[PDB]
A paper describes a structure:
Two plasmid-encoded dihydrofolate reductase (DHFR) isoforms, DfrA1 and DfrA5, that give rise to high levels of resistance in Gram-negative bacteria were structurally and biochemically characterized to reveal the mechanism of TMP resistance and to support phylogenic groupings for drug development against antibiotic resistant pathogens. TMP is a selective inhibitor of bacterial dihydrofolate reductase (DHFR), which catalyzes the NADPH-dependent reduction of dihydrofolate (DHF) to tetrahydrofolate (THF), a necessary step for the recycling of reduced folate cofactors. Trimethoprim resistance in Enterobacteriaceae occurs almost exclusively through the acquisition of plasmid-associated dfr genes that encode intrinsically insensitive DHFR enzymes. Expectedly, all three enzymes form the stereotypical DHFR fold with an eight-stranded β-sheet, four α-helices (B, C, E, and F) and three catalytic loops (the Met20, F-G, and G-H loops).
The crystal structure of DfrA5:NADPH:TMP, solved to 2.6 Å, reveals major perturbations in the overall ligand binding pose compared to the structures of EcDHFR. Here, the diaminopyrimidine ring of TMP forms interactions with Glu28 (corresponding to Asp27 in EcDHFR); however, the trimethoxyphenyl moiety is oriented horizontally in the pocket, and key van der Waals contacts are lost through the L28Q substitution. Overlay of the EcDHFR:NADPH:TMP and DfrA5:NADPH:TMP structures shows the D27E substitution lays the foundation for the divergent binding orientation of TMP. The additional methylene unit in the side chain of glutamic acid results in a 1.4 Å reorientation of the carboxylate head group, subsequently pulling TMP further into the active site by 1.1 Å. Variations in the GH loop likely enhance the positioning of TMP deeper in the active site of DfrA5 compared to EcDHFR. Although distal to the active site, the GH loop makes critical contacts with helix B (residues 25–35) and is four residues shorter in DfrA5. Downstream effects ultimately cause a 1.9 Å shift in the Cα of Glu28DfrA5 compared to Asp27EcDHFR. Despite co-crystallization and soaking efforts, no density was observed for NADPH in the DfrA1:TMP structure, while in the DfrA5:TMP crystal structure the adenosine and phosphate moiety occupy their expected binding sites. Interestingly, the ribose moiety is oriented away from the active site and the electron density for the nicotinamide is not visible in the crystal structure presumably due to lack of interactions with the protein. Therefore, this somewhat unique conformation of the DfrA5:TMP:NAPDH ternary complex likely prevents favorable interactions between the nicotinamide ring and TMP and contributes to the reduced activity of TMP against this enzyme.
Residue numbers in the entry:
A (entry chain B), B (entry chain A): 1 to 157
Amino acid sequence: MKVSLMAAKAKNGVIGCGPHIPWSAKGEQLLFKALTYNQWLLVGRKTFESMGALPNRKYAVVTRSAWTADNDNVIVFPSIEEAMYGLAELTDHVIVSGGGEIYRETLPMASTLHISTIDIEPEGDVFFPNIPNTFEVVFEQHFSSNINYCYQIWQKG
Amino acid sequence: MKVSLMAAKAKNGVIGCGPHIPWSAKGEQLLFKALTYNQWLLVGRKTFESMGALPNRKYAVVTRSAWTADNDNVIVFPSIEEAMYGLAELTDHVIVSGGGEIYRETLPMASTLHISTIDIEPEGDVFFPNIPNTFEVVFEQHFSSNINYCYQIWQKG
Ligand SMILES: COc1cc(Cc2cnc(N)nc2N)cc(OC)c1OC
Ligand SMILES: COc1cc(Cc2cnc(N)nc2N)cc(OC)c1OC
């Protein structure tokens, strides 16, 4: 199965200040809605709880705890390893859609990054990992909004 | 300024049966909405009338008549050269968003294509031109829907 990764980070690499995103870049989330439509996503438990489920997406949620989910559209996995083995029988394609921890543990398995950088440098204590130079930008487009943002697609070369 | 082009075509190349699109693929238009967000779009006058202005988007519309719009978000030009010269004072980027005529006229200026191919072969007045080998696919993603669709980004090689 193909592993993609989709994130939005500030220019200082912040993705998270506790359970919040410390910015609202009007329009950016349309990109996430476009590329996740009828896809399978892999999310950490904290990101899943803070951001909720959208319709027309399936979720693999990883926890080390006894946490569970009423949603029929969700499968809980005890590890990333297990989620990958599971997903591989359920889909051609999974989009890793966050957690700091999840991004750190999955970035090496990804063949395509969808990265949005927001024109702000806010307070924060979760950070996107460093992008290995095995990856190259193949597409980029700037957006003007309340806070500008840059969308880039990276492929593993 | 960089010229992109964004289109959605059936597998047989149909983009239009008169002023309608002969199909509705749930999900696909999210990609159009996310990539045109707060961008300048170049549209022919026929497409503009049949499909209407969207909010949060700027329009360069070309006519060979004295046709005009009812919208301070719209600039009418008598030619594509005039539209380009005018836009270049306002923006580093324009997305050509159709007409069959417009696509044919502008494909030679475009350095990035955003092409959605819908899994259907309907009847069609209007067709997307053939993609010259001057361009190469740099990204691709498949979507399952009521009608499946494939999204590809082509760059000028
Ligand atoms: C996993 O849950 C969501 C996460 C995000 C964050 C996010 C926002 N933008 C981009 N490009 N990638 C992301 N991962 C955004 C969301 O909706 C806009 C989510 O709703 C399901
Ligand atoms: C020119 O305005 C629109 C055009 C289209 C057709 C279209 C649909 N999908 C893609 N990817 N590109 C397109 N050009 C679709 C639209 O709405 C979903 C438009 O907004 C009114």
